[PDB]
Design a protein around this nucleic acid. Structure first.
Ligand SMILES: [Zn+2]
Lengths: 58, 159, 103, 218, 142
RNA sequence: GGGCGUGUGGCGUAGUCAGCGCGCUCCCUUAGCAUGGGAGAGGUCUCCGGUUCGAUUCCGGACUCGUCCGCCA
RNA sequence: GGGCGUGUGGCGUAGUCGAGCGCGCUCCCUUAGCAUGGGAGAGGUCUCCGGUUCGAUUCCGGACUCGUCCGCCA
RNA sequence: GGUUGCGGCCAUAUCUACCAGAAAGCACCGUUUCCCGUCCGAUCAACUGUAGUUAAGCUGGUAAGAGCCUGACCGAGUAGUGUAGUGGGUGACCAUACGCGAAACUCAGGUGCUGCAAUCU
RNA sequence: GAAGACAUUGUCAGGUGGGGAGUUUGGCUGGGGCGGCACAUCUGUUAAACGAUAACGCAGAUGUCCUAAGGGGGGCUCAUGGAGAACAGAAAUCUCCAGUAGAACAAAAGGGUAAAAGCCCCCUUGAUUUUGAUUUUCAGUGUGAAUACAAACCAUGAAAGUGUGGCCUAUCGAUCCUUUAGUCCCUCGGAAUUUGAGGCUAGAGGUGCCAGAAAAGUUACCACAGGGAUAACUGGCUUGUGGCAGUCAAGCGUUCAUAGCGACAUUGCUUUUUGAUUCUUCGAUGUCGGCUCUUCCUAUCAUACCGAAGCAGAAUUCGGUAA
RNA sequence: GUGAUUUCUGCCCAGUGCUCUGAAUGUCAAAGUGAAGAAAUUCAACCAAGCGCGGGUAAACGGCGGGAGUACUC
RNA sequence: UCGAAUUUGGGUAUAGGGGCGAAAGACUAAUCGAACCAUCUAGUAGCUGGUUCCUGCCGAAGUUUCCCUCAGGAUAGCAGAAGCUCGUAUCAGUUUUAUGAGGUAAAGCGAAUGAUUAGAGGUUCCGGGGUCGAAAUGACCUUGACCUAUUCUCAAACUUUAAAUAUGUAAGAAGUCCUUGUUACUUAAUUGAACGUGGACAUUUGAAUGAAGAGCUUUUAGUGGGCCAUUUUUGGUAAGCAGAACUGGCGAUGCGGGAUGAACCGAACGUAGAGUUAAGGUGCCGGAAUACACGCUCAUCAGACACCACAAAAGGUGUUAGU
């Protein structure tokens, strides 16, 4: 009792029903996978920038 | 059985080329990548470390991470019915800058220059590109260009 | 394969925290103790009528085992394990390969 | 014991040459490809006649051998053994396979059917195209009527349709008759064993003068 | 490991098997279908290498049988005393743990050592027990 | 029909781009009871094709022999 | 029915295109038996028919004959 | 413009056979105490710039040169190919419509350009 | 009378025990069985120039090997060919020239590599520790393999740097249980000390039917649920094979291709052979052969009328209209 | 088990069974003995039958081969 | 077969894994390869059959991965429902421009690898056969190798070159430019890196076309046997055969045409009226020209329309038109 092995028939129709949406891009993407020596300094840089802006517009 | 390894069906894809084998030139090591650059991916078979997979050959992506000898690139891969985000760590021998991006930036700076110079007069800048318009009227003359009559040629064997 | 009897490697023994000298042995399993909880449960389950109550493995397929080296730091006596790939022949006695000599 | 040629007439498969993945083929039945006065010079035989296909099919090596023998026998009987030069311009490189089934009674008890039905080599064939020359003969202008009849007798051994075309070239070369005549009146041709070497304006002048002296003798 | 599994159909003649926890060497193999529908059964007739007894067995063909590791090793005699051979390895190692053979092989070896030939002894290892099977004489390097 | 092994001198087996043992034939020796030694001579490497200076051991294709299956309709 | 191979003196048997041996018995010699040996003999249309060659046991084609192998149904 | 040091592109730069090279620079070249390495101060190491030489390296030029590079309406809109027809043909296959468009071949031309620093009749 | 603290009896323990009990006795598959592994993987191709892509498609390979065949550095250039030198020749060692790799890099194949990734030499253990992220297979799970970093500690070199095993693509394994290493930390719940036991983090012992049951047969005495998803008739598609017919004509036929034949080739037809396939039928279409009886086909054995002959007659052969 | 009468029932005890009044440490349970420990416990020695070693048994299950020389012999 | 191992009445004994058997798996109340009765029991079934009113709106899948998985499930996909946040966009089975990537079709072999036909010129301390030679690393021919310049033909697992069709990215406001703040990162160094403050550039704000609203979430059904057509393509002699790729269909779908038919052509459907057509047709059946125009064909088996229901090689002073 052999049967059909594999096909890709109807698959693109199924995809293009409500399919091929591009992913939503955002301002400020995720920083995971970025180098830890860069992120460790970036935290302190933004902390100092926020403190300077708070002291400027306090 | 079947065989789907990591470098299956990559024979002509990862051959080097004709008469440019050997070591790689130093421009690929002297080129500088920053975060947000748009790069093309083309693997170098002479360098076995930091190789991309065969799917990403000829793919174009965006730099998100810069390390000592490699670059992190973001690709959008169609999986099923949507695109997924893929992060790749590739050595710099397998990437180069995309020239379309720098062409577009040249268009941006020349376009801003045109707008800046024509803002002093207000002459309807018309900064959008336009495609190939139909060609307009013209008068072609026969002075020294009298028409030559052509006819179909009869059949011959020609062997 | 052949592995030398000594090796300079890292020791996380809370006083070394560096590469020290290590003497290597091969890991032996040691005898299965009675009064381990699984052994007690197995004996209690096997007592009485009902026959064999747990599976016994038959379809053996491997011919080798992964070898495990027991490293022992010579300074502070702390021990480490590391495994190797599968090998049919293993020895710790160092008879070094020599190149330009006869068969 | 051989299948009819209609089972292998058409180019249905990819080319399957003898290689290091075949390693067991039968040898071809045609072995001689140039015959007649094959050692003749180039200007001995000005006229050239082609048997050329009009089909896209496969010609068997057995059919090539039979047509070669037929045309050679007819022309040597009517015109002499050394009045022509015949050349077979196709070579059987495609290998034909057979999935041999047993012809015994009650064969299905041991046949296994279409399982593992990859064939074994049994023959060799040459794949021709539209307007591809099978046979080419060069002779003098006094043997046109016998070489056309020889090719016409040879055409019966081939499947499909073939045409007999009298070429405009000089012999087995690729120049026209007046082009070759105006080339050979100068010394810029020089004979070889059967063919002829030509002069070019490129190359070193010393070699171009040790060869081909009569043209520079101007 | 000392021993490794194998399939009955993968086994063939002059190969080693484990039958009733004994190292055995096959002399006969025969496969007969169980029933017309069913798989064939393998009958195995083998001889123990150490003791010489004949041991047989019948199994399914797909069944897995245990197979020993047999190593044959070449040594030179030093002395035969008290029924224990003393042997000498290449690179100069010496063992005295081998017991002398007890049969006509042992008798022929004893007479050959008494009349003074240089004797080359083949001893086999399988499953932790050791014995000597054959001896020759060194034709050169006297 | 298919599958799996098979093939080297009188015999038996090993295997480097054909070796030993045993018979044989000689020679020498031992009273023996039994001998022993030294030399030989002997193989299309199953067969047929492509290579190579050396080819079993390089390669490919075929043959012989021994087995095992060829069932249920 | 088909395939593959085979065919030598009265018998067995050797044959690379240029019919030998052994056995039967013809004769002679030879024998204290419990009967041998030795020496000269006879013996083929190389299964038959055609072609090639210069000449086919030898090469080829056909026929005959013999020996193997595979084959009807539910 | 020549030469040296470090290069970029990596034959228009390579290869074969000849010819030429003022000045300077490279180079060959002289030496073995010291550092160092070899069977061998040949390579490598060190010393002198002295005893010499453009012979070679190197650079440039020559060749109906080989190769390589560029271009062509040269082959050729050819081969191939996306779309279409209730097109042809027993078939094999082939024409047409709307589009895209090669390679070999032939011919013509060319034979390194250049960045930084130093130095030169 | 006999026997006697031995038999017997009771409870445990070892052996024996198809006499009996319970159960099992893989999958894929041009039906099943035998065969094979297409069941976990790897290279090239099929594969139609992104990726993906099947068949019991083709050509092969894996369950290993390596303390160096890993890491770093230095020096050198290979296969082959030519020309030479006592023994020394086809092949021993030495010398020169040419040599884009035609060699080598553990193995299958494909890529990659020339002051090297090859050969030789020197020093070593980065084949180390701690957990994260990413790529392939993919559900964007696991496993395997791999990539780039961070924090240490090392190796090597003058140094820049390079190194988290093998130049790259294969070389392998969950829960439960046992055992080892670390923390010597947590718990044994009325309170302590010491054994013992149980936990936490990281390995090993293995499931190859490789996301991982503990497993022999027979049934012609057989049973049930189903299946035309699936074989054993007929019918249908195909016609290799079987049968029949052509075309061409090297030759046979004393001479002479075609009176009669006809090699090497090649074009067809038929479904009275056997295969191939699985479309219909498994809530059944009564599968040998013979007897009986009707009709149809023609590829004509005889009878009717003819043509041809290597047709003198006789006999015969080839062919036509003809069922 | 074989299946009246008559006439015979050959060879083989290696295997599988069956059977010994043989010989005796190889395998070797529980109880018991000894050592260590604070004890749970661990380790040894000793260790019945049966296996293992040694015999018998085919009117027990069964089995009854190859290569040479000249039926016979090796 | 009929004087006994005879036939038989009544009494009596043996009861279901049990009996009894001159042995057939026979008999044990029409039940026997384990009787009958009741209960457990409404035993389980991935398997077969059935499953009850109307209308409206939307509307599939036979595919991915894992499983003793292959007649079944889980998971993803396809679908419905409930909506939520917003109001013309952080869109698009499309094109253009710019820029990448690929190794198929083709082509090539006097280009590498491999196969391969034929001569020519050379090389013999450097071949083999003959003949002449005392012989000769002798000669003369011939034949083989190797080299040189040519020549004929090829490659799924060959390639310098190399399309068409498909395929990645970009075409701005989350942008560009100017100035200068932070840092424990980095640099010889306010050198750079990243994120910032303040300022300038607006409807041609950065190509075309269209937008039918755009984005987001939860939950759940059915499905997980497919099949056909054009083109590319694999195994096979082939098949209404088996297996793949892209698209369109049938399944799930009626209507007009192909006489007839799941898939072909045309066209997709609320209930009606009028008009015009598609594909197909207009002698009659049959609605519609026995229209018009130029030719060809006469068959003692004419021919008559794609899928499609067949015909070839070879021939013919039949006839027509050509070279
Ligand atoms: Zn330590």
């Amino acid at each position: 009792a052999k049967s059909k092995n594999h096909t890709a028939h109807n698959q693109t129709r199924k995809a293009h029903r409500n399919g091929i949406k591009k992913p939503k891009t955002y301002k400020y993407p995720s920083l995971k996978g970025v180098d830890p020596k860069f992120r460790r300094n970036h935290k302190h840089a933004l902390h100092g920038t926020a403190k300077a802006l708070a002291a400027a517009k306090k | 059985g079947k065989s789907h390894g990591y470098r299956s069906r990559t024979r002509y894809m990862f051959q080097r080329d004709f008469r440019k084998h050997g070591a790689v030139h130093l421009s690929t090591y002297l080129k500088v990548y920053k975060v947000g650059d748009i790069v093309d991916i083309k693997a170098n078979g002479s360098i076995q470390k930091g190789m991309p997979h065969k799917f990403y050959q000829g793919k174009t992506g965006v730099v998100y991470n810069v390390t000592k000898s490699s670059v992190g690139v973001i690709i959008n891969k169609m999986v099923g019915n949507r695109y997924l985000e893929k992060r790749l760590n590739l050595r710099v021998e397998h990437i180069k800058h995309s020239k379309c991006r720098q062409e577009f930036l040249e268009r941006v700076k020349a376009n801003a220059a045109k707008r800046a110079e024509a803002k002093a007069q207000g002459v309807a800048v018309q900064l959008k590109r336009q495609p190939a318009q139909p060609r307009e009227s013209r008068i072609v003359s026969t002075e020294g260009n009298v028409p030559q009559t052509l006819a179909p040629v009869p059949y011959e064997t020609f062997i | 394969v052949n592995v030398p009897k000594t090796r300079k490697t890292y020791c996380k023994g809370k006083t070394c925290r560096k590469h020290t000298q290590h003497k290597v042995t091969q890991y032996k399993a040691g005898k299965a103790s009675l009064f381990a909880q699984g052994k007690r449960r197995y004996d209690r389950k096997q007592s009485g009528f009902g026959g064999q109550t747990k599976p016994v493995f038959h379809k053996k397929a491997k011919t080798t085992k992964k070898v495990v080296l027991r490293l022992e730091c010579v300074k502070c006596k702390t021990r480490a394990q590391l495994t190797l790939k599968r090998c049919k022949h293993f020895e710790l006695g160092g008879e070094k390969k020599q190149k330009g000599q006869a068969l | 014991a051989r299948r009819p040629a209609r089972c292998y007439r058409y180019q249905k498969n990819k080319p399957y040459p003898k290689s290091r993945y075949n390693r067991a083929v039968p040898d071809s039945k045609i072995r001689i490809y140039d015959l007649g006065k094959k050692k003749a010079t180039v200007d001995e035989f000005p006229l050239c006649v082609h048997l050329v296909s009009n089909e896209l099919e496969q010609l068997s090596s057995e059919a090539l051998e039979a047509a070669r023998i037929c045309a050679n026998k007819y022309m040597t009987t009517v015109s002499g053994r050394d009045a022509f030069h015949l050349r077979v311009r196709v070579h059987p490189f495609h290998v034909l396979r057979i999935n041999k089934m047993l012809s015994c009674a009650g064969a299905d008890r041991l046949q296994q059917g279409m399982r593992g039905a990859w064939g074994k080599p049994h023959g060799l064939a040459a794949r021709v195209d539209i307007g591809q020359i099978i046979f080419s003969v060069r002779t003098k202008d006094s043997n046109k009527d016998v070489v056309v009849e020889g090719l016409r007798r040879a055409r019966y051994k081939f499947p499909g349709q073939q045409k007999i075309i009298l070429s405009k070239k000089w012999g087995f070369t690729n120049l026209d008759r007046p082009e070759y005549l105006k080339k050979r009146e100068a010394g810029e041709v020089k004979d070889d064993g059967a063919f002829v070497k030509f002069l070019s304006k490129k190359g070193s002048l010393e070699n171009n003068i040790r060869e081909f002296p009569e043209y520079f003798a101007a | 490991s000392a021993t490794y599994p194998m399939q009955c159909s993968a086994l063939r003649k002059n190969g080693f098997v484990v039958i009733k926890s004994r190292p055995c060497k096959i002399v006969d193999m025969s496969t007969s279908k169980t029933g017309k529908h069913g798989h064939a059964k393998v009958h195995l007739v083998a001889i123990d290498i150490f003791t010489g007894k004949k041991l047989e067995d019948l199994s399914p063909s797909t069944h897995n049988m245990e197979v020993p590791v047999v190593k044959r090793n070449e040594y030179q005699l030093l002395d035969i005393d008290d029924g224990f051979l003393s042997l000498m390895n290449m690179d100069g190692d010496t063992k005295d743990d081998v017991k002398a053979p007890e049969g006509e092989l042992g008798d022929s070896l004893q007479t050959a050592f008494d009349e003074g030939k240089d004797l080359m002894v083949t001893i086999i290892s399988a499953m932790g027990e050791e014995a000597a099977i054959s001896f020759k004489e060194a034709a050169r390097t006297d």
